[PDB]
Each structure stands twice: as C-alpha cells, then as structure tokens.
Amino acid sequence: FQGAMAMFWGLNMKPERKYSQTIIKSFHISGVALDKGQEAKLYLAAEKQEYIVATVTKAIPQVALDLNFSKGDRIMFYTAGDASVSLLGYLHDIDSGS
Amino acid sequence: FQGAMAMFWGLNMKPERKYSQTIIKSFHISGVALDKGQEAKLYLAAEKQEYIVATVTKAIPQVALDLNFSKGDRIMFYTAGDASVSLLGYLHDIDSGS
Amino acid sequence: FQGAMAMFWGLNMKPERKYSQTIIKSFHISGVALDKGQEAKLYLAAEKQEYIVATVTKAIPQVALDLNFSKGDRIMFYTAGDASVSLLGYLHDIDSGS
Amino acid sequence: FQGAMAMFWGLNMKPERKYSQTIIKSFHISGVALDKGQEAKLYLAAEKQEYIVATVTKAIPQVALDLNFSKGDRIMFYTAGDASVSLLGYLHDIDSGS
Amino acid sequence: FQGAMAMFWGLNMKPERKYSQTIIKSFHISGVALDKGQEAKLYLAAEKQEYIVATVTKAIPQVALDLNFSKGDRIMFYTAGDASVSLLGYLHDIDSGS
C-alpha cells in the first residue's frame, strides 16, 4: 500500500469542552481555528500538567501550531471561553519494517 | 529516478466552491491564499465532520497551514464567502522498498 | 559524504519578473521576502495553473511559506507589483540506496 | 511497538525561572505561550551563549517556534519578565536499527 | 548512541556584523530574534548572491524562518541596522549507514 505514514486527523471542540482521551495512535496536531465563537483557549493536560497550547480568539481566528503526541501518554484536550474550534492534524505511523 | 517523494500540488478555489474529492495520492497542503477576493473560509469535511482549516481574507490574504491527507479517506474542500484562493501543497509518496 | 539531502537554494526576484523554469533538482522554497520594494505578489504557474503562493509587501515584508517542487514538472515563478524579493529554499535529494 | 519516534514533551515556566537542565533525550520544542502573565522573554543559554529564542507577551500571547536539542549539550531555559509560559514539544528518538 | 541527527545550533549577531563562514556541518536555522536592538535585517550572501532572509525589528521582534544549508557552500551571514539578534537552529547530520 506504499508509505502513507501520516493519515488525516481532526478535532471539533465545542465551547468549554474537556476531552480526557487516551492515545492508541501517535499523531500530530497542526492547527486549531475557530469559525463560530468568541474565544477559545486550547489547553492540554498531559503528564498531569496543564499546558496552554494555543489561544485562538476572534482576534486570532486560527492558531497553526506544531503539536505531537505518542500512544504512550494519556492527554486531556480542553478549551476555555466561548468558541467552537476545529483542530486539524495527522496520525503519524512511521514504519520501516525491521 | 532517486527519491522525489513529495511532488507539487495546487488547488485554485473559486468563491463558494465545494469539491468533494477522493484521494488516490496522499498529499500535504501547505498554504491557502487569495489574490482576487474579499473573504474565503476554507472548510474541509472529512470523516463526515466539517473542519474549519483556515480563514483567509483580505485582512489575512494568505494562510500558510500544515494540512495532510491520506489516500484512505474521501474529503470535501469548500470555501465560503466571496474570494478566489489558491492552495499549494505536495503529494507525499514516501517509498523505502520492502 | 554522509547525508546532506537538502542543499541551499535561493531566488532573487526583480519587480515584475517571470521565470519559466524547468526543474532538474527537486526543491523546497521556505521563504519569500522583500528588502527593497513596495509590493510583490509571488505567483507560480505550474500544471498550467496560476497559483498565488504569497503576497509579500512593505506591510508584510516577509512571507515564510512551505513550497515544494519535483523535477517532473516545469513551473513559472513570477512576481507582480514593484518590489524585489529574495526567496530561500533547499534542494531535497533524499537518497536511501536501493 | 512500531515507530513512535517523537514523544510528547512540555515545559511550564513560572515568571522569571531559570532551569539549567541536562539532556538525556533529544527533543524539539515547538511552541511557547502564556495564559497567565504580562511578559515572558524565553532565553536559552546553551554552548555558554545566551540565546533569545522567543519573546512571548500579552501582545504576542503565543510564540510557535522550531527548537531542537540533542542529548549531547546541557542547556539552560529561563524566562524574564512576569508571565507563566507553557512550552510544548516532542522528544525525537529516531531509530533505524543498525 | 542512537539517532540524534539534529544537534543544537545558535548564532548571536551584533549590530551590523558580517560573518563570511564556511560550512563543515550542514544545518538548519529556524529562527532569528532580537532582544536588544532597534532593527536587524538578516542577509545571507550565498552562491555569491545577497539574499534577504529575514527582517527582524522591534516591530517584528522575532522571525521564525526555515533556513537550511549544506557543507558544500560557503555563505556569509550579516545583519544591517542596529540590533543584536540571536539565531537558533540545528545541525542536520542524517546517517543511514550504507
């Protein structure tokens, strides 16, 4: 099937949602942006630490950011404020045989 | 022929066009920008989910974004508002033999 | 000689120049910026399609963009407006033997 | 376990903290941003040289930057001003057997 | 020692300095930013051509840019104006045996 490696990923956030989600496939998030919304602060709690990964508002309607996770950790993605943001990314499954 | 891997890709959007297109070659989109136009909201419906990937306007005449798709999914690219945007990217066909 | 893979590339554009150039070495353009100039719209005609890859002006004196081409296509790079822009990039010659 | 290669990394800075830390795992920092804070200047002293890697303020509430370190050097990360910034990155452990 | 590949690199520029330097190790520059300074125009003369790679000022206190050089060329890095800028990057020594 040749090397695809990176397959499309997406995450639609609703105003003040918190998704504590485990990772079965390592992936990279590449952007978070709002179409409908006033303010969305994109927080990530991983390693039991609250990381502020992006602040995407009407003023900054799109935060293109380099995010990457591995299937070893269990992270929580949550947005504060009132806005609905769509994240985009790609699952990275790099294979080189053995 | 050596490793090219990433070959050039481009997509010219017209004001309020919706292209529901299948993927036979995995590719990365790297930028969406408008030359002629007032506003273009670049939406992507993949996995049956409306993702707002970029908002490119006269105010933000160019959104350089990290987009990547695989030949497994069937996505729809569509712009809202009135503007004509040109996306640019590269088809990633990484080969490492077997 | 070890793996260099990506070797330096550069392109100095003069106000309203059009270079229809073939590709013998696949390369990535990573930025277009103006030092002297008022406005430069960086267009790329490839696949016989006019792509607006960047709009770099005095207001936006530098457009860092992810561009990539392969030695299979023959593209034309041309800037509109009055400004002299310097593009920067790197030829990607990835080798992995056979 | 397949190729994960890049595993998630994060760094929460407090206003005017200096962490002189050794590297046992090579990693890339991809963003530094403030949620709470007025100003944070992100300095890095490596090779016994003070590098100003990013200036992230209330005005620029998020600096997405391409940082990369190797397990050979011993660096110091320190922020000046009053703000608490969260850095995000990923440890790059690329393996290709032998 | 596993694959480090990319090792940390940095370059502190003083107001109006010109470093004509040869490359013994291929590297990528990822950002140029000023902490102390009014204006720094980051020029690169390579292939005997003056490239304006970034314009980093008090207004634009940090230019995150994708720069890459190979150990084959001999380049000159020089900043104009009055400001002291710190560049950051990583030497890319990709090895895959033979």
Swiss-Prot record, chains A, B, C, D, E:
Full protein stretch here: 3 to 92 of 357
Phosphoserine: residues bearing it: S96
Stated family: Belongs to the FKBP-type PPIase family.
Coiled-coil intervals, chain numbering: none
Protein name (database record): 39 kDa FK506-binding nuclear protein
Tissue: Ubiquitously expressed, highest levels in ovary.
Subcellular location per the Swiss-Prot or TrEMBL entry: Nucleus
Organism encoding this protein: Drosophila melanogaster (Fruit fly)
Functional summary from the UniProt entry: PPIases accelerate the folding of proteins. May function in a signal transduction cascade during early development.
